[PDB]
Design a protein around this ligand. Structure first.
Ligand SMILES: O=C(Nc1cccc(-c2nn[nH]n2)c1)c1cc(C(F)(F)F)cc2[nH]cnc12
Ligand SMILES: O=C(Nc1cccc(-c2nn[nH]n2)c1)c1cc(C(F)(F)F)cc2[nH]cnc12
Length: 263
């Protein structure tokens, strides 16, 4: 069937000229609302959540791992490194790298997380370990954001990512202290006010991770604590036909508004 919410998401998508993917899980009843929920989309920096979570999982058996220093060299800087560039010729701890990747979207920090896991395939291996058979990370930063239509590299589906984000932030994929740390990091994101959050009532609490890439790819994944109800998990992915297309965070806000209105 096609629901009223799905029809509105299709109208939004048509007006936008692009391709929109949405997955909601309402933990009040475990129900799901999906739009293109099983189509693949480039994750871009939303993949930083899986990398940080994989390091958190490693830290469950190494109490000092998050305090471990990682050298930052001039050659490690890539295209967007607002935190890491302050530490060139010095070090950052794995906690600092996780916070920078998640809250500032630092690409050098992400590359250090990937390297700690043995490469992109180590991130994929963690996804499989927590029951996500769909996620794949194939490249490092910045090339994982090429976002080429039809390219399976560095993609997932909205359904899979919503399920994984629920397990990581509200479920038991991580230990309790690690889950709390991930939630704290997401709630402190600096980059999210124009994306999912912009479509939701201001009283609601949001933790999210944004992403963007070529093909005007504009993404956000969020855990949401609405006023007076159980938490929601919402993924909004958007990509466009031309390589140079402009970002469209407003489309993500509009999708979130349609979802909220449909609860
Ligand atoms: O850093 C960014 N973009 C960037 C930097 C360097 C190079 C290129 C690029 N390379 N080839 N095409 N574009 C792109 C960026 C950062 C952020 C952030 F994290 F919120 F600050 C949001 C964004 N939305 C679209 N782009 C961004
Ligand atoms: O790295 C990139 N973008 C970036 C970096 C850091 C943070 C964010 C971001 N975080 N939350 N929203 N956007 C985005 C990027 C890379 C590439 C390329 F060609 F693959 F290298 C093309 C791009 N077109 C627009 N952005 C890009």
């Amino acid at each position: 069937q096609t629901s009223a919410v799905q029809q509105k998401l299709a109208a939004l998508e048509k007006s936008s000229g692009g391709r929109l993917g949405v997955a909601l899980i309402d933990t009040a009843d475990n129900t799901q609302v999906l739009y293109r929920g099983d189509e693949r989309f480039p994750m871009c920096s939303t993949s930083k959540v899986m990398a940080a979570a994989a390091v958190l999982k490693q830290s469950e058996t190494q109490k000092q791992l998050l305090n471990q220093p990682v050298e930052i060299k001039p050659a490690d800087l890539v295209n967007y490194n607002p935190i890491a560039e302050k530490h060139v010729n010095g070090t950052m701890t794995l906690a600092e790298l996780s916070a920078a990747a998640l809250q500032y979207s630092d690409n050098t920090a992400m590359n250090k997380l990937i390297a700690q896991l043995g490469g992109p395939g180590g991130v994929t291996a963690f996804a499989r370990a927590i029951g996500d058979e769909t996620f794949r990370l194939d490249r490092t930063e910045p090339t994982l954001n090429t976002a080429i239509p039809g390219d399976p590299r560095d993609t997932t589906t909205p359904r899979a990512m919503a399920q994984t984000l629920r397990q990581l932030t509200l479920g038991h994929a991580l230990g309790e202290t690690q889950r709390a740390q991930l939630v704290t990091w997401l709630k402190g994101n600096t980059t999210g006010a124009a994306s999912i959050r912009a479509g939701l009532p201001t009283s609601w609490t949001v933790g999210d991770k944004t992403g963007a890439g070529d093909y005007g790819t504009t993404n956000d994944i969020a855990v949401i604590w609405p006023q007076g109800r159980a938490p929601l998990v919402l993924v909004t992915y958007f990509t466009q036909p031309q390589q140079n297309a402009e970002s469209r965070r407003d489309v993500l806000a509009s999708a979130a508004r349609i979802i909220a209105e449909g609860l």
